[PDB]
Amino acid sequence: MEKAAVNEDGLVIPLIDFSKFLEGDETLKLETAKAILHGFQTAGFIYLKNIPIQPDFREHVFNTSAKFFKLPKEKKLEVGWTTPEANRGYSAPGREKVTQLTDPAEIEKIRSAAPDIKESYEIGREDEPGHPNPWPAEQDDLVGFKSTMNNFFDQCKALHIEVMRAIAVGMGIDANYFDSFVDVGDNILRLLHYPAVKSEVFKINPGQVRAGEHTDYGSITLLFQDSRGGLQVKSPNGQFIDATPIENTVVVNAGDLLARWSNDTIKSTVHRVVEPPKQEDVHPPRYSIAYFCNPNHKSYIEAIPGTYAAESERKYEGINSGKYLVQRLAATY
Ligand SMILES: O=C(O)CCC(=O)C(=O)O
Ligand SMILES: O=c1[nH]cc(CO)c(=O)[nH]1
Numbered sequence: 001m002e003k004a005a006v007n008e009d010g011l012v013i014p015l016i017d018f019s020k021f022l023e024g025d026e027t028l029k030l031e032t033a034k035a036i037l038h039g040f041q042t043a044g045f046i047y048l049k050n051i052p053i054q055p056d057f058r059e060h061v062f063n064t065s066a067k068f069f070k071l072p073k074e075k076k077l078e079v080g081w082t083t084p085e086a087n088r089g090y091s092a093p094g095r096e097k098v099t100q101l102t103d104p105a106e107i108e109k110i111r112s113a114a115p116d117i118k119e120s121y122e123i124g125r126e127d128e129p130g131h132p133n134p135w136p137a138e139q140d141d142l143v144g145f146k147s148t149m150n151n152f153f154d155q156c157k158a159l160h161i162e163v164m165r166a167i168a169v170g171m172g173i174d175a176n177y178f179d180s181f182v183d184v185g186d187n188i189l190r191l192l193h194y195p196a197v198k199s200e201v202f203k204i205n206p207g208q209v210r211a212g213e214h215t216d217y218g219s220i221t222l223l224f225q226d227s228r229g230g231l232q233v234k235s236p237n238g239q240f241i242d243a244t245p246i247e248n249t250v251v252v253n254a255g256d257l258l259a260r261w262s263n264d265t266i267k268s269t270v271h272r273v274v275e276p277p278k279q280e281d282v283h284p285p286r287y288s289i290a291y292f293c294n295p296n297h298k299s300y301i302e303a304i305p306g307t308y309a310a311e312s313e314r315k316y317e318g319i320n321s322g323k324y325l326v327q328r329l330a331a332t333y
């Protein structure tokens with residue numbers, strides 16, 4: 001019913017008014033839920049507008065994130081990312097080093113490699129046994145950092161549950177089917193800062209990007225982006241298409257676990273972040289926030305009802321959600 005957020009090269013990413021799922025009469029609620037599902041089943045991406053998270057709070061959260069990344073290099077490494085099983089803390093991709101152990105076939109590539117021009121900080125739920133968040137010190141500009149981000153984590157946690165309900169309603173299964181699979185909130189709030197960079201850097205280092213192509217791992221990802229642009233989604237014809245920023249929208253995409261969970265009725269689509277499409281000498285800083293939603297780590301993941309007719313259509317063996325994720329997170333090391 002809304003004009004598509006993206007409509008190019010066979011890639012159609014719908015723009016959906018989420019308040020119509022939450023506040024509509026039964027007919028409108030079903031129409032919206034079906035629009036949401038259909039978006040996931042085709043593009044694997046949707047844009048939501050009029051979500052319960054408020055614009056001025058989102059802007060406060062973006063300012064708060066920007067204050068963290070202005071912190072000195074040493075203060076950010078203090079709260080550094082440790083292990084894949086914690087998946088919490090600060091990181092910036094380093095350049096790989098040639099060493100005595102390295103194979104000479106790889107040396108030409110290692111020297112030419114260009115790491116993503118980004119830095120990140122990841123926050124998990126506060127009360128996970130054995131995995132506390134490495135919070136920075138609450139002083140000067142970072143007073144309120146914790147309470148703000150925990151607040152935002154819980155609002156995104158609520159939105160996750162609501163988007164899965166829309167998926168359930170659109171599938172015509174029990175509206176609350178996913179609740180017990182996602183109620184723990186084993187999610188990851190990834191704050192991202194892509195620093196100001198000269199456009200010539202992308203010519204000097206050919207193949208250089210802001211974020212490498214990938215699929216996300218979990219159920220869904222709530223992606224809040226600023227107005228800079230650069231996010232691209234891969235079309236059915238194999239081309240990366242610009243996911244244009246639209247004010248007060250959240251870009252929502254399915255991850256590999258939901259794809260598998262859905263018996264591949266829902267798509268998990270390749271995406272990346274390159275230079276903004278506009279031509280300029282210097283690209284200003286880009287801020288985004290990726291809230292990775294996952295099934296409960298304890299959840300066992302096998303085909304959702306109504307995603308297959310005969311058992312022979314089930315493409316995948318059952319897996320534990322938690323184990324799967326750590327394998328994805330630990331693979332690159
Ligand atoms: O920054 C963005 O717009 C996308 C980042 C992303 O896809 C990710 O962190 O997984
Ligand atoms: O926890 C994470 N980290 C990174 C990704 C992909 O960028 C993901 O999907 N989930």
Ligand code: NI
Nearest residue numbers: 214215216271
């Ligand atoms: Ni991603």
